[PDB]
Each structure stands twice: as C-alpha cells, then as structure tokens.
Amino acid sequence: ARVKRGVIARARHKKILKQAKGYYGARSRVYRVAFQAVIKAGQYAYRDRRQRKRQFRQLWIARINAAARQNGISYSKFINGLKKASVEIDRKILADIAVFDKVAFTALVEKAKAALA
Amino acid sequence: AVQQNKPTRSKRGMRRSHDALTAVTSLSVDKTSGEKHLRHHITADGYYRGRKVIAK
Amino acid sequence: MYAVFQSGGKQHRVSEGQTVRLEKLDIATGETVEFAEVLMIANGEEVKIGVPFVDGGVIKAEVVAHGRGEKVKIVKFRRRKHYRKQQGHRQWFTDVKITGISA
Amino acid sequence: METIAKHRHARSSAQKVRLVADLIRGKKVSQALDILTYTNKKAAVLVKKVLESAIANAEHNDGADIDDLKVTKIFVDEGPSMKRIMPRAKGRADRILKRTSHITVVVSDR
Amino acid sequence: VTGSGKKPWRQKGTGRARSGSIKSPIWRSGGVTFAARPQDHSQKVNKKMYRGALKSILSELVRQDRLIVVEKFSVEAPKTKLLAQKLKDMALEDVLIITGELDENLFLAARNLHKVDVRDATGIDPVSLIAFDKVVMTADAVKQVEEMLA
Amino acid sequence: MKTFTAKPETVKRDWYVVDATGKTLGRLATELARRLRGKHKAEYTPHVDTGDYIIVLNADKVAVTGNKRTDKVYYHHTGHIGGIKQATFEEMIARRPERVIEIAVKGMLPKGPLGRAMFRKLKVYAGNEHNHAAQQPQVLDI
RNA sequence: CCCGGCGAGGGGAGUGAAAAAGAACCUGAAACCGUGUACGUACAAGCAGUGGGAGCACGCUUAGGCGUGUGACUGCGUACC
RNA sequence: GUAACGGGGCUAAACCAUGCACCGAAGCUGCGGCAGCGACGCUUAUGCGUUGUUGGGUAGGGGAGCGUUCUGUAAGCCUGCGAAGGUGUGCUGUGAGGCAUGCUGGAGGUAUCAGAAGUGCGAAUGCUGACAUAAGUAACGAUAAAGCGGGUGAAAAGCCC
Incomplete structure (x- = not known):
C-alpha cells in the first residue's frame, strides 16, 4: 500500500502559512521560515499573557499616584491609608475612578488620610 | 566577493527607485507639414521650420 | 451613577442598564443574581465602604446568555531540546445585565 | 467598453518592457502613441504594436471612436524562459535564460 | 535496480555530497529502502479455536433467529428462476441454505443469485455463516454440523 | 471594559514658566522631566505624550553643589578620527548655558521617538524673558 | 473579418454542454513576478513578532463606546537544526 | 570613544543606625477550568456535588489518540440537483483533526467496526524539478579600421552594388 502523501501535507503547510499572515516578507510567504515565525509568535503570547497583568497594574499604580499626589498624599501612604481604612478593599484597576470621577477620588484620599491620622 | 544573505524583493524595488524612463514632452509640429518632430530635428518627410530641407 | 463589586475574583465599576462579563456563574440563563456586598456607590455624592461593603447597598442583574471565550493557543518550545507542545484553551464566562444599584 | 490586445511570448524580459509600459499607463491613446514613437527602447516598438492593434480592435470590433480612447490599463507579465548554456572558462558551463513577456494593453473610453 | 556500481562522483572535492550508488534509496529514480517480497499472510488458528469459533457463531445465528432449519431444501431443476421463486415464497433474499450433501442443481441455481449462496454441510465456513441475513440449513445438515463440531 | 487611554488628539497640555535661578539642576531636571512626560495625571498612557509645555528661565544661574561647577565631567564625541571633545560645567554655562x-x-x-x-515641549532660555507671551504661561516651581 | 512583416501574437465570428477545453490544451497547489485598491511609511536604529494602542478604512445594530484590514506610538524580545 | 555607579544626575539620590509605608515573580491567595493517581459521601453493566492531592523536563520507559493508502462491511451509502482535488469561510476538538458550507472543478467518493501498511519531513553540503538572488551588473572572444552613395526590405552599422 504505497501512500500518496501531499494532500495531508499541503494541509499542514497551509495551516501554518495561514497563521502567519501579515508577517514580513518570507515570514508570511515561505513555510520553512513561516513556521519558526509562528512558533515564536506563540511563545511571545504565552509570555505576554503573564506580562499583560504586570503592565496594567503598573499603569494603574502610576495613575493612582498622579492623583493621590495631586490631593497631597503619596501613593504609598494613600494605599496604607485605604488599607487601615476600617478595612476597605478595592482593586488598583478599579481606582480608575481616579480618571473618571475626581470627586469620588478625593473622597477616597480623605477616608485614607483619616485612617492615618 | 559575494552576498551573505539574499536581498529582499524590496531592496530590488528600492534600488530601482530611479530606473524610470522619462517621457519626451518636448516634441512639436511642423508649421508646414503634418509632422510631429523632436525639437531641433528634421521631420521625417524632411522638413525643418517649414522650409522643406533635405529633399529625401 | 455607578457602583463597584467583587464578582470574578475581580472587581467591576458598573451602572444600571450596563452589561458586564463575569467569570462563570451557575445561575440559570434568565434568572436574577443579587450582588449584596458592593464596595462603593456614587451619584454626585457618594458612599465608600468605611469598612468593606456599604451598609445596605445591593446590586441586581439578570444573567443573559452563558458562553465560552475565543480559543487561545498555548505554545511551549525549548530550542535545541527536541521539545515542544501546543495547547488549546477557551474559558467559560457568564454575562449579566445590571438592573439594580439599590443605593 | 474595454476591448483589449496583447502580445504573448514577447522576446524581451518584462522588467524591460515594463519600463516602457509605465510611460504610457492611463494616457490618452493619442498621447500614448507619441510617447512610444519617440522612445528609443526596443520594447517601445513591441508595445506600440500592441497599443495599435488594440486601438484597431476597438474601432473595428466595438464602439470604436478612437478619439476618446485611453490606455486605461497596461501591465506585462512574464512568459516562459527558454533555457540555454554558455560555454565558459576552464570547462565550466553556465546557465543563461532567454526571457520572454506577455504584454497586455487595455484601451477604453472611461 | 538496473544500473552500475560506479560512484557518481568523487568523495571529496566537487562541492557536492557524498553519493556512492545511483541506486540510493534516497536518490530519485531507483531505490526503495525495504522493498517488499511476495509474502504468505496465512495465520494458524488452533483446531479447537476454529471449531470453538463456529459453535460460537451458530449459537448466535440461533439467538438472532437467523438460523432457520427446514427438512429438505431443494429445487427441481438447475434454474435460477425456480430458486428465485422458492426464495420469494419463503420470504428470503439474503441466504445461506447450507444443505446436507449438496445437490448440483441448487448449486447451479443460486450462482447468478448474488445475495444468496448454497453450501454443503462439511463446507460451511466462518465468515459466510456471518455474511448473510439468514442461513437456512436442513435437518439433514444439522445432524452433520452436529457430528462435525461435536 | 479596558482601562482608559489618553488620546493624542484630545489631550490638554498647558504652558508654564520656571525660573532656574538658584535651583539645583537635576533636582530641577527631575521635575521638568516628569511634568515633561505627563507623569502627573492620566499619564496612565505611556505611549501618549500627556506632558505640559514648560518654558525654563535664567538657566545660566542654575545651581550645582559640591565642586561640580569647576569639575563636572561633560564629554562628547564627533564620531571622527579620534574626536572626543570635553567641556567643564563652568565652561558650558560660559558658552550657551541653556545646554546644561x-x-x-x-x-x-x-529612550526614543516618543x-x-x-522634550520639544521644553523651551529653556539662558536669559530672563522669553517670547511666548501668547501661550499665557503660568508660573511654577521645584 | 480586423491590427501585424502574405510574421510572431492578438481581437471578433463560429463549433461545442463548456474554449472558466484552442493544440504549451483535464484538474491546475507552491515558491517566484505583476496591475488595482484600503491602510502605513521620508528625525528613524537591531530575529521584524508579541503585549498595550491612537487614527484611517470598511462591515456592523437603529446606536451602544463591537467584526475585519491596516498599525503611528509604546513595554518585553539575539531564528531554527 | 566619556567607558572602573547602566545612564542622567546626586552632597545625599552616599555610608551607618532605628523605624513605618510602598513596589516587586509564571512563588502564595482569589474566581473559573482540564487531567493523572488515591480514597469518602450519594450510590455499583457507577459516575459523580465529588473529594485530598499531583501536573518544568533532554536521553530514556510507560499510557492514550489523529490522519493517510489499500481489504472487507459495500450490488449498501453519497454523488452530474456536482465526487476526488484546489481555494475561502463557519463552527467544533486539549491536540494531531473533524464537520459544514461559498467559489473552482466535472467523476468519482465512501460511514461504521474491523484488517494490512511503500502512513506522517525543514534540516542528512540529502534526490529530482521548478523558481528566486546577485543584476539588467560582468561580458559580447586577439587594438588589422573604417567612411559614404545606391539597393532590397516592415526594419539595414553588420546582407547586396
């Protein structure tokens, strides 16, 4: 039983070239190049899924600080405050109120400032 | 000396960024015969500034 | 006029009428969950959980279709070590609409 | 009405024919014919002959009225190569490809 | 493969790659790494497993009442049409009809009948026992398949 | 519901005026830079320039600490032959102070492009006035 | 029948179920070369992706702050055997 | 080429000492999910609310599967109201894949359960073919040498006079 080979093969190469669209020059044209190109894209996105979560928190923190510092408190103390603030728990992401409700924020600083007094 | 990596189909492109021919623009028509003709040149039937020169 | 609440393992700022995607949630497709520990509410003048959770603030929403997110690929590949595996994973989620925000 | 004419197996590379072809593209068929007559590349004649045949095709087989015609479309694709050898120094034999094109001209009035 | 022992080109020097026989399985025309020979695929099968198998399949024919024994199944002359008749009559189309001593006409009939096949008792094989919708079998023959299987 | 991005086309900006005079360069730079980068607001978007335009003033009078005034490094290289020029802090306050x-x-x-x-937002000046009255610069410090 | 060198090639006509069978003729992949359109690109430095992400373009549903393409700017990042 | 703080810069943004915040990892926690190996409670041709726990990995051992050709099942089933193949898309699978369907194509393809293997390729300076690169670059083969008039011709430096 001599076996054709080829359709099942063209299936694969196409499967990879398809995942490699928009990649530059041979990255998106030539299987042998295309492959190693997909695999790293894969490895980058497994890394970067983990990364993303770091990136945002640092985005958040940065802007919490801008705001805290604008109401005359450092991020560090502000957090400490919130932490002591009769418990009082509340994502750093969530503290986007920072951008979209400057009055609800100063509220927070006050609550915080207080639990620190 | 020979290349170490194959040049991209793009570099060819860029190298050729200057290969374009230039079209003429600068031809005119003889006041006396039909005859378009390059400026400062004899027209085929043999005219130049009206006045049929070169009898051939 | 919004409020905040813990529900994924994550928190969410939310206003009535507004839909949010939460992690999965047994609650059958059409019924009504009631988030009864909101960590803040606000109009023009607002209520922070002096402790966690504002005294009597609750939030109501109706589940509204369950689902599975778009597949994602897990690639592991150790160069020169004759090693690699690829993997597919999806992720259940339930979606709620938000009718509540009972101050 | 489109109406077109083409030269397949043209004995010129393509790269070279294109050089001429880009002079002409989208020109008034009239102004096209002039740019061609006064272009000294052997491709020029190759492509003038197509333009001409194509215009003729227009006037005879369709609406015609060559007064409105434009070379609305011109592009030249590469034909098959004839393959040869070049006896060379020290017994080495070298490849060499005689290349050919397919010229296509499309002329219309819109 | 028809060719020569000659080594296509030197070992070292031409910038090419070893090479040694124009017949390399890896070379184009000519090769085949483990070329087949004609082979015998017969398998053994213990006796007691062959007999054991048959028993196992009769029993199941019977349990699906696909086994329909009759006294004397036979026909009057070698005419497929005739047989085809009896079959229509008995509500049969896919059948075995394994008879005792085999007559000849019933073999001659049935031949062109494609969904049907007749055998003598001592003939009877595993698959054809399974292959048909029903298998008939005469008292004449059961006594025989009896002895046979013991 | 993703976190917010400043958006280059809606971002505010604002002008200011800072007197460098007695200020200790570098504790000043530090501020210019952070404000320069928008790091004080909805920065919260590091791909977008949210900084304020700050115009500096009296750079020549900027202040230094230790012996730096006479001793502060200041090297650079013309990428020629063996072209490594250097200039002392006072040498630089001397010819075009703005530079420091x-x-x-x-x-x-x-880093790079962004x-x-x-940095173009920062318009320094060695002297004591500037020609950006129209921008209505508001004064500030550090 | 027409362009052309009583060419090469081509446009019609016509045959044919079909010339999306015209002789280099079933199907007709891939590398590789073009024409056309969206988007990007002439102060920008590195395995060229990946994470975030404006803008433009096109589809959305009567908006709903979505899909597809593109991808300024930005964190991370030295191919495979 | 500054080049012996990573840089800017720092007189503290350095050292020492005490203290309290904070940031910080694919560690730990939270929510959702899958599997391997155990064993409760509900209850056995048992999987479960489940439940404790484990889940980096070359060489190597073990386990479970995809798909390809060909035999049977198949004188069945699908198919000119469009097979195989080619090219999109959609949904699905942990994956190898599957299924649907637009386009192309225009005569063959086969579920299922089993059976057999010329069963899976990126690398062997692998074999064949096709096609890129360098590049419209080198070169056009003795530095004995050409000029013009007429001619034929679609075109003549190169043929003819």
Whole structure:
C-alpha cells in the first residue's frame, strides 16, 4: 500500500502559512521560515499573557499616584491609608475612578488620610 | 566577493527607485507639414521650420 | 451613577442598564443574581465602604446568555531540546445585565 | 467598453518592457502613441504594436471612436524562459535564460 | 535496480555530497529502502479455536433467529428462476441454505443469485455463516454440523 | 471594559514658566522631566505624550553643589578620527548655558521617538524673558 | 473579418454542454513576478513578532463606546537544526 | 570613544543606625477550568456535588489518540440537483483533526467496526524539478579600421552594388 502523501501535507503547510499572515516578507510567504515565525509568535503570547497583568497594574499604580499626589498624599501612604481604612478593599484597576470621577477620588484620599491620622 | 544573505524583493524595488524612463514632452509640429518632430530635428518627410530641407 | 463589586475574583465599576462579563456563574440563563456586598456607590455624592461593603447597598442583574471565550493557543518550545507542545484553551464566562444599584 | 490586445511570448524580459509600459499607463491613446514613437527602447516598438492593434480592435470590433480612447490599463507579465548554456572558462558551463513577456494593453473610453 | 556500481562522483572535492550508488534509496529514480517480497499472510488458528469459533457463531445465528432449519431444501431443476421463486415464497433474499450433501442443481441455481449462496454441510465456513441475513440449513445438515463440531 | 487611554488628539497640555535661578539642576531636571512626560495625571498612557509645555528661565544661574561647577565631567564625541571633545560645567554655562539643563532633562526622559517628542515641549532660555507671551504661561516651581 | 512583416501574437465570428477545453490544451497547489485598491511609511536604529494602542478604512445594530484590514506610538524580545 | 555607579544626575539620590509605608515573580491567595493517581459521601453493566492531592523536563520507559493508502462491511451509502482535488469561510476538538458550507472543478467518493501498511519531513553540503538572488551588473572572444552613395526590405552599422 504505497501512500500518496501531499494532500495531508499541503494541509499542514497551509495551516501554518495561514497563521502567519501579515508577517514580513518570507515570514508570511515561505513555510520553512513561516513556521519558526509562528512558533515564536506563540511563545511571545504565552509570555505576554503573564506580562499583560504586570503592565496594567503598573499603569494603574502610576495613575493612582498622579492623583493621590495631586490631593497631597503619596501613593504609598494613600494605599496604607485605604488599607487601615476600617478595612476597605478595592482593586488598583478599579481606582480608575481616579480618571473618571475626581470627586469620588478625593473622597477616597480623605477616608485614607483619616485612617492615618 | 559575494552576498551573505539574499536581498529582499524590496531592496530590488528600492534600488530601482530611479530606473524610470522619462517621457519626451518636448516634441512639436511642423508649421508646414503634418509632422510631429523632436525639437531641433528634421521631420521625417524632411522638413525643418517649414522650409522643406533635405529633399529625401 | 455607578457602583463597584467583587464578582470574578475581580472587581467591576458598573451602572444600571450596563452589561458586564463575569467569570462563570451557575445561575440559570434568565434568572436574577443579587450582588449584596458592593464596595462603593456614587451619584454626585457618594458612599465608600468605611469598612468593606456599604451598609445596605445591593446590586441586581439578570444573567443573559452563558458562553465560552475565543480559543487561545498555548505554545511551549525549548530550542535545541527536541521539545515542544501546543495547547488549546477557551474559558467559560457568564454575562449579566445590571438592573439594580439599590443605593 | 474595454476591448483589449496583447502580445504573448514577447522576446524581451518584462522588467524591460515594463519600463516602457509605465510611460504610457492611463494616457490618452493619442498621447500614448507619441510617447512610444519617440522612445528609443526596443520594447517601445513591441508595445506600440500592441497599443495599435488594440486601438484597431476597438474601432473595428466595438464602439470604436478612437478619439476618446485611453490606455486605461497596461501591465506585462512574464512568459516562459527558454533555457540555454554558455560555454565558459576552464570547462565550466553556465546557465543563461532567454526571457520572454506577455504584454497586455487595455484601451477604453472611461 | 538496473544500473552500475560506479560512484557518481568523487568523495571529496566537487562541492557536492557524498553519493556512492545511483541506486540510493534516497536518490530519485531507483531505490526503495525495504522493498517488499511476495509474502504468505496465512495465520494458524488452533483446531479447537476454529471449531470453538463456529459453535460460537451458530449459537448466535440461533439467538438472532437467523438460523432457520427446514427438512429438505431443494429445487427441481438447475434454474435460477425456480430458486428465485422458492426464495420469494419463503420470504428470503439474503441466504445461506447450507444443505446436507449438496445437490448440483441448487448449486447451479443460486450462482447468478448474488445475495444468496448454497453450501454443503462439511463446507460451511466462518465468515459466510456471518455474511448473510439468514442461513437456512436442513435437518439433514444439522445432524452433520452436529457430528462435525461435536 | 479596558482601562482608559489618553488620546493624542484630545489631550490638554498647558504652558508654564520656571525660573532656574538658584535651583539645583537635576533636582530641577527631575521635575521638568516628569511634568515633561505627563507623569502627573492620566499619564496612565505611556505611549501618549500627556506632558505640559514648560518654558525654563535664567538657566545660566542654575545651581550645582559640591565642586561640580569647576569639575563636572561633560564629554562628547564627533564620531571622527579620534574626536572626543570635553567641556567643564563652568565652561558650558560660559558658552550657551541653556545646554546644561537641556542635556540634563534629556538624559531623564525616555529612550526614543516618543520621549524625544516630549522634550520639544521644553523651551529653556539662558536669559530672563522669553517670547511666548501668547501661550499665557503660568508660573511654577521645584 | 480586423491590427501585424502574405510574421510572431492578438481581437471578433463560429463549433461545442463548456474554449472558466484552442493544440504549451483535464484538474491546475507552491515558491517566484505583476496591475488595482484600503491602510502605513521620508528625525528613524537591531530575529521584524508579541503585549498595550491612537487614527484611517470598511462591515456592523437603529446606536451602544463591537467584526475585519491596516498599525503611528509604546513595554518585553539575539531564528531554527 | 566619556567607558572602573547602566545612564542622567546626586552632597545625599552616599555610608551607618532605628523605624513605618510602598513596589516587586509564571512563588502564595482569589474566581473559573482540564487531567493523572488515591480514597469518602450519594450510590455499583457507577459516575459523580465529588473529594485530598499531583501536573518544568533532554536521553530514556510507560499510557492514550489523529490522519493517510489499500481489504472487507459495500450490488449498501453519497454523488452530474456536482465526487476526488484546489481555494475561502463557519463552527467544533486539549491536540494531531473533524464537520459544514461559498467559489473552482466535472467523476468519482465512501460511514461504521474491523484488517494490512511503500502512513506522517525543514534540516542528512540529502534526490529530482521548478523558481528566486546577485543584476539588467560582468561580458559580447586577439587594438588589422573604417567612411559614404545606391539597393532590397516592415526594419539595414553588420546582407547586396
């Protein structure tokens, strides 16, 4: 039983070239190049899924600080405050109120400032 | 000396960024015969500034 | 006029009428969950959980279709070590609409 | 009405024919014919002959009225190569490809 | 493969790659790494497993009442049409009809009948026992398949 | 519901005026730079330039600490032959002082294209007035 | 029948179920070369992706702050055997 | 080429000492999910609310599967109201894949359960073919040498006079 080979093969190469669209020059044209190109894209996105979560928190923190510092408190103390603030728990992401409700924020600083007094 | 990596189909492109021919623009028509003709040149039937020169 | 609440393992700022995607949630497709520990509410003048959770603030929403997110690929590949595996994973989620925000 | 004419197996590379072809593209068929007559590349004649045949095709087989015609479309694709050898120094034999094109001209009035 | 022992080109020097026989399985025309020979695929099968198998399949024919024994199944002359008749009559189309001593006409009939096949008792094989919708079998023959299987 | 992004086309900006006079360069640069980068608001978007335009003033009078005034490094290379020129701090305050503060906060903004833009917002000046009255610069400090 | 060198090639006509069978003729992949359109690109430095992400373009549903393409700017990042 | 703080810059943004915040990892926690190996409670041709726990990995051992050709099942089933193949898309699978369907194509393809293997390729300076690169670059083969008039011709430096 001599076996054709080829359709099942063209299936694969196409499967990879398809995942490699928009990649530059041979990255998106030539299987042998295309492959190693997909695999790293894969490895980058497994890394970067983990990364993303770091990136945002640092985005958040940065802007919490801008705001805290604008109401005359450092991020560090502000957090400490919130932490002591009769418990009082509340994502750093969530503290986007920072951008979209400057009055609800100063509220927070006050609550915080207080639990620190 | 020979290349170490194959040049991209793009570099060819860029190298050729200057290969374009230039079209003429600068031809005119003889006041006396039909005859378009390059400026400062004899027209085929043999005219130049009206006045049929070169009898051939 | 919004409020905040813990529900994924994550928190969410939310206003009535507004839909949010939460992690999965047994609650059958059409019924009504009631988030009864909101960590803040606000109009023009607002209520922070002096402790966690504002005294009597609750939030109501109706589940509204369950689902599975778009597949994602897990690639592991150790160069020169004759090693690699690829993997597919999806992720259940339930979606709620938000009718509540009972101050 | 489109109406077109083409030269397949043209004995010129393509790269070279294109050089001429880009002079002409989208020109008034009239102004096209002039740019061609006064272009000294052997491709020029190759492509003038197509333009001409194509215009003729227009006037005879369709609406015609060559007064409105434009070379609305011109592009030249590469034909098959004839393959040869070049006896060379020290017994080495070298490849060499005689290349050919397919010229296509499309002329219309819109 | 028809060719020569000659080594296509030197070992070292031409910038090419070893090479040694124009017949390399890896070379184009000519090769085949483990070329087949004609082979015998017969398998053994213990006796007691062959007999054991048959028993196992009769029993199941019977349990699906696909086994329909009759006294004397036979026909009057070698005419497929005739047989085809009896079959229509008995509500049969896919059948075995394994008879005792085999007559000849019933073999001659049935031949062109494609969904049907007749055998003598001592003939009877595993698959054809399974292959048909029903298998008939005469008292004449059961006594025989009896002895046979013991 | 993703976190917010400043958006280059809606971002505010604002003008200010800072007197460098007695200020200790570098504790000044540090501020210019952070404000220069928008790091004080909805920065919260590091791909977008949210900084404020700050115009500096009296750079020549900027202040230094230790012996730096006579001793502060200041090297650079023309990428020629063996072309490594150097100039002392006082040498630089001497010819085009503006430079010290510039080269200063530059080293503090980030990297490439973006950060490079951020720096154009900063208009220094060796002297004591400037010609950007129309921008209605508001004064500030550090 | 027409362009052309009583060419090469081509446009019609016509045959044919079909010339999306015209002789280099079933199907007709891939590398590789073009024409056309969206988007990007002439102060920008590195395995060229990946994470975040404006803008433009096109589809959305009567908006709903979505899909597809593109991808300024930005964190991370030295191919495979 | 500054080049012996990573840089800017720092007189503290350095050292020492005490203290309290904070940031910080694919560690730990939270929510959702899958599997391997155990064993409760509900209850056995048992999987479960489940439940404790484990889940980096070359060489190597073990386990479970995809798909390809060909035999049977198949004188069945699908198919000119469009097979195989080619090219899109959609949904699905942990994956190898599957299924649907637009386009192309225009005569063959086969579920299922089993059976057999010329069963899976990126690398062997692998074999064949096709096609890129360098590049419209080198070169056009003795530095004995050409000029013009007429001619034929679609075109003549190169043929003819």
